[PDB]
Amino acid sequence: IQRTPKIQVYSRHPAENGKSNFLNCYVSGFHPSDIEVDLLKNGERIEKVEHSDLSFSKDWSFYLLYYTEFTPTEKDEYACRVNHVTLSQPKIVKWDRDM
Template identity: 55%
Template structure:
């Protein structure tokens, strides 16, 4: 029993030492080139972060977009994690689409904007 406790403590210390705090890298994009009034998918991919204390929200004009889907949390080499959240949407001129990412105590918004939309 003592060996099991020592092994568990060793694993916890090893994971803690190996996983240094890393801020997330965030990419906000759409599945297809943006066109107003056309069905599309808004995607927010967050990678390279540790620890895995993170929340991702997809927003339209500052309000949560319902029915979003999120992948399972996965890790990469060096105990850095990645996560993707997406939702079906139809871009409308003048509306703001953002990805809000909270990692630990830090929160930032990342925009998907008009420079992604074709007006033709």
């Protein structure tokens, strides 16, 4: 069974420009467990990114939370880059303030 990952990019708290926050990328519903997840700032990989411990849901598909501390601004763009065996090329999901 091969399940492609679902991806959500969001902040821990509502985005306030200039105030510290946490940038999250939640990947879930995928199988097998091998996956590469990167957080991007203006298209560039953020180096210091942590992630939760591998777990799975009732249907056996896996989920992971990748997160890093960030200070959002009005100009900076953020995204989450995900590669998986079910994807021919990495998928990039841009961060949206309202999602």
